[PDB]
Amino acid sequence: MFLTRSEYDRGVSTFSPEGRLFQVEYSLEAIKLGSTAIGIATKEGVVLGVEKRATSPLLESDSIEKIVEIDRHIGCAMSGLTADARSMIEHARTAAVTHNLYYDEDINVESLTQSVCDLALRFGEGASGEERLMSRPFGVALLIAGHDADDGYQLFHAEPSGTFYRYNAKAIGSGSEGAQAELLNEWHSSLTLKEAELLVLKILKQVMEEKLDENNAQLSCITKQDGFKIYDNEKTAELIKELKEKE
Amino acid sequence: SCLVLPLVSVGNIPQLSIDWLLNSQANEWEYLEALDSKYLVEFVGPLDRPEDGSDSLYKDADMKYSSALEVFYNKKRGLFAIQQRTPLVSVNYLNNFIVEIILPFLSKYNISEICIWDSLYAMEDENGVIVRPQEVYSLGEFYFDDEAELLSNLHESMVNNWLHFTPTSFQDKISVDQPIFKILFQILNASQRPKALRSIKYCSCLANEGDNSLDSQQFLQWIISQKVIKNAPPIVKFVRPISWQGAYGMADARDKFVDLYN
Amino acid sequence: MFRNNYDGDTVTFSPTGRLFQVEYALEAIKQGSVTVGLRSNTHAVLVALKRNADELSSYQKKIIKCDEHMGLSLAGLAPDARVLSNYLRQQCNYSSLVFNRKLAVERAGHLLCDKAQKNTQSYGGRPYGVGLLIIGYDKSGAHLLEFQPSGNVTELYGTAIGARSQGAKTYLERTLDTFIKIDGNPDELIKAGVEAISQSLRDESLTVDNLSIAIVGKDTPFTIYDGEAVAKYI
Amino acid sequence: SAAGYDRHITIFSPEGRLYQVEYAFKATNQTNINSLAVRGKDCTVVISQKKVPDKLLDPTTVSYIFCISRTIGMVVNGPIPDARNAALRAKAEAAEFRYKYGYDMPCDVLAKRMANLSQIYTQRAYMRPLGVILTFVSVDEELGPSIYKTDPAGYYVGYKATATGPKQQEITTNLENHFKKSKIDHINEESWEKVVEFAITHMIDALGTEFSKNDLEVGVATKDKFFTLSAENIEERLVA
Amino acid sequence: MLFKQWNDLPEPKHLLDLPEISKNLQSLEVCPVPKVEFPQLDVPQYSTAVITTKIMNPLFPKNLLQLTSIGEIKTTLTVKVYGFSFPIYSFGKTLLFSMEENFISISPIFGNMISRSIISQLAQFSPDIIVIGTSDKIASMKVMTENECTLQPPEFITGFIGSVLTQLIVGPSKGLKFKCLVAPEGPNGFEKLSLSDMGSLVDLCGQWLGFEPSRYSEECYRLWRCDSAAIGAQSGLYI
Amino acid sequence: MTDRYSFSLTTFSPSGKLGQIDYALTAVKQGVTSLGIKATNGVVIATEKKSSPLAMSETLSKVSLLTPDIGAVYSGMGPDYRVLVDKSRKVAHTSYKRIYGEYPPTKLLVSEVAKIMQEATQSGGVRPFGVSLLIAGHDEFNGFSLYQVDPSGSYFPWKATAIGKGSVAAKTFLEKRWNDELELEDAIHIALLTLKESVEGEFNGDTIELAIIGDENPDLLGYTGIPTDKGPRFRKLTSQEINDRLEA
Amino acid sequence: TSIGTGYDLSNSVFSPDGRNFQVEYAVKAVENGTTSIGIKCNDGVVFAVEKLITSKLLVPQKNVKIQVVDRHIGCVYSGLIPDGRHLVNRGREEAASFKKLYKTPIPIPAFADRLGQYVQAHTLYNSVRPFGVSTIFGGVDKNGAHLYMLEPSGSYWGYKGAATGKGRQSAKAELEKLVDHHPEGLSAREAVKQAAKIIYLAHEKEKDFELEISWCSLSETNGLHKFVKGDLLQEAIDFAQK
Amino acid sequence: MSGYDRALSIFSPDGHIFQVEYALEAVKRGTCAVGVKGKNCVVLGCERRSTLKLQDTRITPSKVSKIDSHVVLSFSGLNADSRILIEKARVEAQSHRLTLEDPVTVEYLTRYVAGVQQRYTQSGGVRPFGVSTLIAGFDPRDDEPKLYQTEPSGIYSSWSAQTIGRNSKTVREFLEKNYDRKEPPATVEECVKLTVRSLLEVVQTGAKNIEITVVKPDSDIVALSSEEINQYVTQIEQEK
């Protein structure tokens, strides 16, 4: 009966006595160190929204890219380490383009998400039995918003553990707790695209330390007709003014 | 009257040795007091018992919990023993722990001898204090009455020669980085050190990390055989406490995994 | 305390002769939800309780089809379940392509055991941490197997794995003579499985969102029921 | 104690020693068995003590003497798994020498080859030395009767006669005394049976104990073949 | 892998990699001890006090209990400066002392001093005391009192909960009644719990605090799965 | 991919010393003494064949011919020396004989051996060699030469030197007994005298190993008919010759 | 000391006394396994295993604790189940390769040597661990009946009677008594009865177990490995009880 | 620390990789570098350690290196690693020009350098580059100035004005107080003056320890001489 140090949480291939892998937990903590991203799925499209957190005013605000296009019908928002996200985005774009080349059709949103999760599995044995490729798990989480003919509009949450979930509304990053608590109460199946955008802006304003404006926040949407588009500053400013007038 | 103080060192060998000492001679030992655990990592747990079925050292009926730092007393031999569950929160507070805890206890109980148990890891011997690697144990003795010249003085680095080690010990000098050097400096430089304290003995071993139960038993056997403590009687039975049955987890967890062992 | 010095990896024995990393991998199974499998002389059934992250999320898929005549359910680590399911699909595909054969269930169990044993004796990797229940129908009839990631496989009439599976297992063992003779009546066997998995519920009720069923049989290909398809079984 | 990374791998200690090599040397005496090798005029004799205290063992399967090639025999001091490993390696080496150079491998060359492999083990961090001592005997077509010995350190050397084991000092002293009396480096006998009897008597005198037919193993190398005697042959040799 | 690195030998585990108070390790002086200021709150107005850590935040829903902040316990350390703030909450006639632990940046000495101050202040009126915590040495959920210990050797409790129990049991103001609830990995401030243990905690906390099981269970269940500290990778790693 | 590399077994200490090289030097200092003396018309290399009494001295030789004009001796660990000698004999042919049709000069072969020894210190798989080598030779354009090579791979030329357990006293004796007009026979006598103070037990031709680099030996060529074919210059003295020189 | 501190945290390391403690710990793991025995009769081998009674849900005919490496080789093991399965698979592969190459069933000593070399190869590097199983195997070849026991160190020997597992001491005592009382030899059926008796004695604390007996005899099974049928198994159980 | 800082592949319990932070600490010890882009140019300024009396100055390498006729690069941190990075960047620029007939853009080269730095953090047997880089230029057939910053972890960002290295916090604060994005310096002279004044906040000696390089569209790269920098310093001091 003595207190001694335990070192089961250092190796990614080491089990805890209860069967946990604590390096994955610490990667999730690294994700929580990132900025906030929110996705809301409706029947008229899916809305993504991120907070632009700038350490210095000299940083170009139009340079932070937390929202990227994987394909015309698939967009993504990232939270965590940027280089890991860059690698994952490259892989996802390659998968979509190659599927189009070989099958002459758009890839399903769930199929792309599964491919990304299979890539994330590479810190261990691969999904098809490939050898280990990474020394550590990724430290970034993804929100993948897409539209396909088979399943309509979809929103997926992808984690470094290699598991993805389908969500009606999701939040990741530093303010993910309060944002998700608000999403649990403010989401319903009959939301319109405009209402979803306003709700995303409101929840971002709630969990942001700085005052919400067009410079420190970014919005994007995906619809069946227009595809994936990131709103310019003027449209977001108009939406913020409308939300302020409503509240 | 001698007080046995273990140090949190490599392998937890001194602490385990204490578990060997109290449990093997449980008839002569009783729980005495709980010292202040201000500078330790605080500890709460049940009352340990010997495996052989002897009565618990905690004679108080209503007592139900044990603390980090506890002092046991042997009336027949008049020996105090310190049992410590957790290390110090930081090394910087070591100077406090000897001064604000150990020295007041020595003054209060008029203890005339302090024996400190310690272990050393050979791979960390940066100052080369190990001169005879073929020897496992080291013993050092210090007397205030004999060393009257050195006690009264004004006060050449990375080493200390105050202790007197036997020629068969593995070391002749101690390193300044070792905790024992700081403990000795605090004891000798103390203004309110008890006048009854006359002998400081230091028993150290060399070992490695792992299951050090047998190593601790052999260390205790060597300490007893050398008669470092005058009133310490030889141990023949060597009973373990029941807590050691949970060293590898649950006692009967091997039969749980029927898919692995058959 | 002494266990803490000998649980670093899978190539280290304890002084008492224990391999702790494999034990931890086995313990990882109870972190998953309960799944039940049973069979008769003509059909084999899997029943799974699915879990969701929250009310806004979907439920995890616990039943995966390997081939028209064989499937499995999982309990434990998701990546290991994904890897093993893909491996079994590859082996069935190889059998069909090269020999025009339907892969036997016993052969699949042997292959899984061989693959799992390797990770428990070499340095660099970790043991798998998911338990599997495999059902199938082949030339020897209906088969149910339990796979433990230490590299063990057992053949049973019925079993349950996952958290709180002991109640379902006890119910299955008590009523073995009942479902052992439900031949030609798939509905009765599925109902028995549903009752068995209900025996393991704690402050929860089966819904059309958290219940998953799978059946294979003599003339019935491996079929998975989710949603309204299980509504009549609740 | 090695007291450092030398507790696992073969690197230099501050004193300039390799502790893993010395520990393999210590492991060579685990079986508590002594072996003796002597040279005749045209034969070489090896005798190994056999200890089978367990009644459940089959004695016929207990042996530390191996046939490496047609003319080369080997005796091993140490644990039997490493002994069998070394035996298979030596067989492969002898066959490969014959294939590559067109004539049978000499005993000393094989000993040098095994010593070079042991040197690899002593120098490489991720390879451990084998805890065995090897003694190759033959009747070489150029050098006559030959005994060579190799150790875990990679050291090999030839001997007029040799002894290996916990009681090797007494046997070596007795051999030295006999050779000083005879003033020759070999045994002056014409039949290998007489050499076998002399070696048995020397072992009995050195160890101070009597041996039966089941307590010893005997191997004899002539210019034609190396062969191991059976229980009946040893029993016949004892009667003299 | 063909091999394991030759220099990859484990270090001795008898020492805990706790943060250092002063950058000078060879000094022979006396290290300063942090001081705790308890704000002055009407202690007799409250009949019950619950002491726990931030990992048990989902057990106390804000809306249902109407949590209100009273004041802040101050902690200061000066070494030749570290400052910490300890919020105090109140719901109904119950006080709540929830401490945040961080083995990376916060030394246990702050927790020891805070526990001593809290116990000394609360001993002036002898109210009901409830302690909620976790331990990585126990195999199942434990309920303990001042006159009963369900722990079996070698199980034990350490950390802030250990400090609080030590002050309650062998402190100068000992003998006070308390109910302690301990749940069965991870370092201080980064611990994880299983779903079954979380549900058991919810049920026992509701029983001890006197609330309707249904609404309290729903609120706590919702709070646990909203990316709480102890629910890190449960959903995404196990099925 | 943690198995694609192994960390260095030889690293710098804070004082600026490579510990493994120093420990290999310590192992060299614990070995049997070996010396070399350079004269005007030859070089002498000597060592003590310290050994079991039942071991045949002629089977194991610490002096090795590298080329017909270059020989070597060592102090330290025997197996490392044997491996290095095999490698040096092979390298003399791979790099020089099959390219220029000639055997290499002494300095270049010494450089090759030194490079091989140096590569053992920039490694994560092997520890450095534990031997020190004395290499004596003759070549057409440089005359007679004697070199010492250390475990670190450093090498230096010497007029006379000694390595091993009794290196300091032997060096003192050689310093007090060396001149630039010495002859080969005088060098042999001085080598015997120096080895006399180092050997503790029997000091005869069965416990001493001597080799010389002197004049060509037509009798050791093995064939006759080509006047321009020079015989070997390396020659190992027999036990009888050593006994005769000791008696005189 | 049974615990070598500082020399037991990596495979293929020598202690100052020349011991390999990881192999010894694998032996400790073996010693906690189920009791298994083997008896060599006049012209064959008999294997006996004690089994714990499991749930009724297990299929009775698909749970066999005695493995058949080849038509003439029987095998049992004590220790880790996956290690035993791996070793049995390797043995089957070796036997098949030998039979394909040389058109004859592999002799028992050659099979034993191949298994021993394979096991010994796992005590050479730190990237693997020794097998945690001890294996008792045997059979009949042109030279007669052979029984061998193989240990985690790779050491194997031929035996007149072998035992492994928790109840190894009592089983070994009974085997020694059986050898002493039958200097002339023993027959296959008498060996089956004695194996049943020895398993029953070694089991005796949860008095609930089953017994599996297999045999290979030239006179009885024509030099083939076969499980003991209902009548002979019942007779052996009755003899063991009485 | 606390045992989580001995490898690149270890996450801290709070989700940090400490070796990356330590590489940033190594970067912090290098000389300060500043990048400021105006309306039609980019200016890179560098602090130079005072040259020793006996040190040759004609062939000493400059702190600003030309990756291509339109892209330049400055660095802060370990000087020796910067050479490897610069060589790789130049090779990549030529390779892209050969493969696609088009010269690289500034963002593409920044991404390539960041990719190399990221790759050198993906193995336990390699050491990351302890260098932070500032990459400036103009895209081909374009007139929009581009300035990017790259870090040892492989992260890159785009800045209107940025500082790296020793005492970069003071220079960053000065730039934040004295730079307006909506009204950048409309001329080269204003941008150079702002850069020099920013560097003078931390440079001790003055003009002789300041290097200024100016990049304009259409592949116009100019390295200002010591006389021009001295004139700028004297004008700034007079206006002060």
Author numbering:
A (entry chain E): 1 to 247
B (entry chain 5): 2 to 156, 161 to 267
C (entry chain F): 1 to 234
D (entry chain A): 8 to 243, 245 to 248
E (entry chain 4): 1 to 40, 42 to 81, 117 to 220, 222 to 276
F (entry chain B): 1 to 51, 53 to 249
G (entry chain G): 2 to 205, 208 to 245
H (entry chain D): 1 to 240
How do the authors describe this structure?
The increased abundance of late-PCs (doubly capped with Pba1-Pba2) allowed us to resolve the structure of this trapped late assembly intermediate to 2.3 Å without, and to 2.1 Å with C2 symmetry imposed during 3D reconstruction. The symmetrized map, however, was mainly used for data interpretation and confirmed the immature nature of the trapped assembly intermediate based on several criteria: (i) Pba1-Pba2 chaperone complexes are attached to the distal α-rings; (ii) two nearly completely resolved molecules of the Ump1 chaperone are encased in the complex; and (iii) β5pro and parts of β1pro and β2pro are observed. As previously suggested by our cross-linking experiments, and in part consistent with a recent report, the 148-residue Ump1 loops around the inside of the cavity formed between the α- and β-rings, contacting α1-4-, α7-, and all β-subunits except β6. In contrast to previously reported precursor structures, the N-terminal 20 residues of Ump1 are well resolved in the late-PC structure. In contrast to previously reported precursor structures, all 75 residues of β5pro except −65, −64, and −13 are resolved in the late-PC structure, β5pro reaches through the pore formed by the β-ring to the α7-subunit and is sandwiched in between Ump1, β6, and β7, presumably helping to coordinate β6 and β7 incorporation during the last steps of 15S-PC assembly. In the late-PC structure, the β2-subunit has undergone autocatalytic processing leading to the exposure of the N-terminal active site Thr1 residue. Nonetheless, a part of the cleaved-off β2pro (residues −27 to −12) is still resolved in the structure. Of the proteolytically active subunits, the structure of the β5-subunit is most divergent from the mature state. Similarly, our late-PC structure shows disorder of the S3/S4 β-hairpin loop not only in β5, but also in β3 and β4. In the α-ring of the late-PC, α3, α5, and α6 are shifted outwards, α4 is shifted towards α5, and α7 is shifted upwards towards Pba1-Pba2 by up to 5 Å.
